[PDB]
Design a protein around this ligand. Structure first.
Ligand SMILES: C[C@@H]1C[C@@]23CC[C@H]4[C@@](C)(CCC[C@@]4(C)C(=O)O)[C@@H]2CC[C@]1(O[C@@H]1O[C@H](CO)[C@@H](O)[C@@H](O[C@@H]2O[C@@H](CO)[C@@H](O)[C@@H](O)[C@@H]2O)[C@H]1O[C@H]1O[C@@H](CO)[C@H](O)[C@H](O)[C@@H]1O)C3
Ligand SMILES: O=c1ccn([C@@H]2O[C@H](COP(=O)(O)OP(=O)(O)O)[C@@H](O)[C@H]2O)c(=O)[nH]1
Length: 443
């Protein structure tokens, strides 16, 4: 028997695909151990078939992460901090596990988030193969490796509406938004790319017919074999949710006509002004469409939840909730469209459920996802110029009601079908998974 160790980054958009992958590999006969921080841990009782080992932030907590806040932008500093100081502990934990292994059981490989670049040298030092799971798109990676030219052309220094050079898919504004925090980002992205290239293999949460134009960059830039597997088509991430589900939404969805509901969610970490939260509310009401709006407590700066919102302002058409099983909501027949912040997991879930999108973005890979989905695949409409009630309502009605938006709704249905076909015998994702399992088994 063969065991796989997976090591996720402890945030919702990173824990979800890694535990989806773990379940896919378990279904192929591998045993599974998950290394995880105590911070943002998932419910281990949801995974009785996995062994969990909590590392790196056991108390006594290191002076470096002990004081760090658990929410907000600062919470993510754990990532560079662990990258720079976690190697010795990670090596100890891997050796302990390999020493306690049964005789009929070998550890085939370690799979980490690509952001754990420090894990490559640890795994090398144990003669352990490391595979990398990319939680962002191939298009995003193509932009990463093109950063030399970007800085060179002056894109990275504060021409906004012009097509970027040798990247006609993007506007300069997209690059400026995506790489706005350069000094801090440049080092992380450089190290992540370098150690991804040195890995034994790269698993992408995508499928070939989604990102066909980007396959050549990956083959040329990454010498290790790449595997494209659309995880949401195998299973939802419901079991790895870090917050409790409000499942009362399904009884409400069951009262809505098919394709009549706009689902609205801006992810697991974004936050907005009070000024913008109220403009978003006014756009929603102005569209005259039914909506289900997930608002994380903490989404609005300066309020605990939605205190700025007058009582009854959503009316008959709208409901606001703290958190849902998102892919299961997207699969419900009532859903007509998805207003997303363009996180990659949300984007791919909406594609795999065939739901057209309205795109906003909060930086990082989000503006690139929004531009690729709206202009290359044409499965949504991109609100690329702030929050304005009038523009919001027009975008919503264009995707959900206007005859002019029919091609977008049709494109989303066709793309879902292409994803389903990729999982059949002979399809691209079926063959990638088949190859991934035989590759891991040969290690
Ligand atoms: C590893 C990065 C370093 C860091 C932490 C510190 C830093 C930064 C945030 C930037 C500046 C402020 C500061 C200080 C501050 O934390 O607020 C600075 C950038 C980002 C850092 O990682 C981010 O940590 C967030 C939690 O704080 C997560 O929610 C992650 O992302 C979430 O899930 C994804 C699904 O794959 C996305 O789809 C994404 O939409 C979604 O937000 C991850 O985003 C992406 O960063 C992309 C930037 O290029 C990468 O390409 C990766 O692919 C990576 O996925 C955190
Ligand atoms: O109410 C919600 C909102 C989102 N999610 C899940 O949280 C993840 C968000 O990841 P994404 O990459 O889209 O954005 P991030 O939060 O990392 O910015 C996705 O898997 C969603 O299905 C959820 O389960 N319920």
């Amino acid at each position: 028997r063969r065991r796989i160790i997976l090591f996720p980054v402890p945030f919702q958009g990173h824990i979800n695909p890694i535990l989806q992958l773990a379940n896919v590999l378990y279904s192929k006969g591998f045993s599974i151990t998950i290394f995880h921080t105590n911070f943002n841990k998932p419910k281990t009782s949801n995974y009785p078939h996995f062994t969990f080992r909590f590392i790196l932030d056991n108390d006594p907590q290191d002076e470096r992460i002990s004081n760090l806040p658990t929410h907000g932008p600062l919470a993510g500093m754990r990532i560079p901090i662990i990258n720079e100081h976690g190697a010795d502990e990670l090596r100890r934990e891997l050796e302990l596990l390999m020493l306690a292994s049964e005789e009929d059981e070998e550890v085939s490989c370690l799979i980490t988030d690509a952001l754990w670049y420090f894990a490559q040298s640890v795994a090398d030092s144990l003669n352990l193969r490391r595979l990398v799971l990319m939680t962002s798109s191939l298009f995003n990676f193509h932009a990463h490796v093109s950063l030399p030219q970007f800085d060179e052309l002056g894109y990275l220094d504060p021409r906004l509406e012009e097509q970027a050079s040798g990247f006609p898919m993007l506007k300069v504004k997209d690059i400026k938004s995506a790489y706005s925090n350069w000094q801090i980002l440049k080092e992380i992205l450089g190290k992540m790319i370098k150690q991804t290239k040195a890995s034994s293999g790269v698993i992408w949460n995508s499928f070939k017919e989604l990102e066909e134009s980007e396959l050549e960059t990956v083959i040329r830039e990454i010498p290790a074999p790449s595997f494209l597997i659309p995880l949401p088509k195998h299973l939802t991430a419901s079991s790895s949710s870090l917050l409790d589900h409000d499942r009362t939404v399904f009884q409400w969805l069951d009262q809505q006509p098919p394709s009549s509901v706009l689902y609205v969610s801006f992810g697991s970490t974004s936050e907005v002004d009070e000024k913008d939260f109220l403009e978003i509310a006014r756009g929603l009401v102005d569209s005259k469409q039914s909506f289900l709006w997930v608002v994380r407590p903490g989404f609005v700066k300066g309020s605990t939840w939605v205190e700025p919102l007058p009582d009854g302002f959503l009316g008959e058409r709208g409901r606001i909730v703290k958190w849902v099983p998102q892919q299961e909501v997207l699969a419900h027949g009532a859903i007509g469209a998805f207003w997303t912040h363009s996180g990659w997991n949300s984007t791919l879930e909406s594609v795999c459920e065939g739901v057209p999108m309205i795109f906003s973005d909060f930086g990082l890979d989000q503006p690139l996802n929004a531009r690729y989905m709206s202009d290359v695949l044409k499965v949504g409409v991109y609100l690329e110029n702030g929050w304005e009630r009038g523009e919001i309502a027009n975008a919503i009605r264009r995707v959900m009601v206007d005859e002019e938006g029919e091609y977008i709704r049709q494109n989303a249905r066709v793309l879902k079908q292409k994803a389903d076909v990729s999982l059949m015998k002979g399809g691209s994702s079926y063959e990638s998974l088949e190859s991934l399992v035989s590759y891991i088994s040969s290690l």
